[PDB]
Amino acid sequence: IQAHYDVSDDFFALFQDPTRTYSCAYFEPPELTLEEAQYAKVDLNLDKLDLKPGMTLLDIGCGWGTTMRRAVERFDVNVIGLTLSKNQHARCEQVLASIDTNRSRQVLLQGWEDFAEPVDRIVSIEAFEHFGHENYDDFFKRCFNIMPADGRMTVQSSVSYHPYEMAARGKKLSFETARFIKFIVTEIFPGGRLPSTEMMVEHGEKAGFTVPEPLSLRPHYIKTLRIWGDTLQSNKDKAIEVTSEEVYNRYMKYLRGCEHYFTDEMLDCSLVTYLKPGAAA
Ligand SMILES: O=Cc1ccc2cccc(O)c2n1
Ligand SMILES: [Cl-]
Ligand SMILES: [Cl-]
Numbered sequence: 001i002q003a004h005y006d007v008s009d010d011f012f013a014l015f016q017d018p019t020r021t022y023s024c025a026y027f028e029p030p031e032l033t034l035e036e037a038q039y040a041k042v043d044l045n046l047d048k049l050d051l052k053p054g055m056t057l058l059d060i061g062c063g064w065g066t067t068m069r070r071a072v073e074r075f076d077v078n079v080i081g082l083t084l085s086k087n088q089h090a091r092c093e094q095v096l097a098s099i100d101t102n103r104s105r106q107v108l109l110q111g112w113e114d115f116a117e118p119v120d121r122i123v124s125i126e127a128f129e130h131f132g133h134e135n136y137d138d139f140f141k142r143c144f145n146i147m148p149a150d151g152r153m154t155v156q157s158s159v160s161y162h163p164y165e166m167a168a169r170g171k172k173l174s175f176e177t178a179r180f181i182k183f184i185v186t187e188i189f190p191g192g193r194l195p196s197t198e199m200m201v202e203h204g205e206k207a208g209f210t211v212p213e214p215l216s217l218r219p220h221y222i223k224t225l226r227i228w229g230d231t232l233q234s235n236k237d238k239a240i241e242v243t244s245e246e247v248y249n250r251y252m253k254y255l256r257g258c259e260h261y262f263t264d265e266m267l268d269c270s271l272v273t274y275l276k277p278g279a280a281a
């Protein structure tokens, strides 16, 4: 049933930047191109992890390998990537083999559940919404236990508010936003579940992590979703013939919809840092 919502990588290519990054860009400075801003977002994440030469970085949901490659090139670190996409696995192996380094580069076709190797630092960019509510305790325990005393993790995730907080903005918008979230979790990311920032923070604390004030990327996702929407819209004919009018309509609704609800502050995007007790000052 969810398989009906499986879409070819070719489609995403028609609205994403050349890196094919499927997550919030970081427009600092404001007038970066989408491509440059996707690199700036990778740097935002990596710059919080206190990476030193010879450390191993684990990337949970390593995508097309852009984060891992930047990490090797900027920080001279070993990398391990986890992905569930064969196509992403293939791309990543070739991206990493392409790098002129002596550092260990490994990509694994598996989830974090199956990963139990010591690593120094963890990065996870918009993979966490594709886990499940009941999995969050196990995820933070795993991350805590596989890292040394000075371990750090960043998790970037799209975020909803608890029904109670949404009701604070009036019942009309709340029920309306609840149904749009349902649509995303059914047809865009089937079986997904949007966490709250509060959940991301408190599950981290329960596992023993120090969690500073999460960074909001709301304004950067608005700009990202606007460019994605405009780009998909300009490639409508091309997009339709690669999939269907059904799929184009679905994704235009997704992109225009998120832009709207991010603007109305019924959705957020959180970059949460998790510091182990022995993390550097
Ligand atoms: O060969 C096709 C292909 C597949 C994945 C990609 C990811 C990022 C950039 C690219 O050009 C890609 N090209
Ligand atoms: Cl899909
Ligand atoms: Cl994709």
Ligand SMILES: [Cl-]
Pocket: 141, 142, 145
């Ligand atoms: Cl464990």
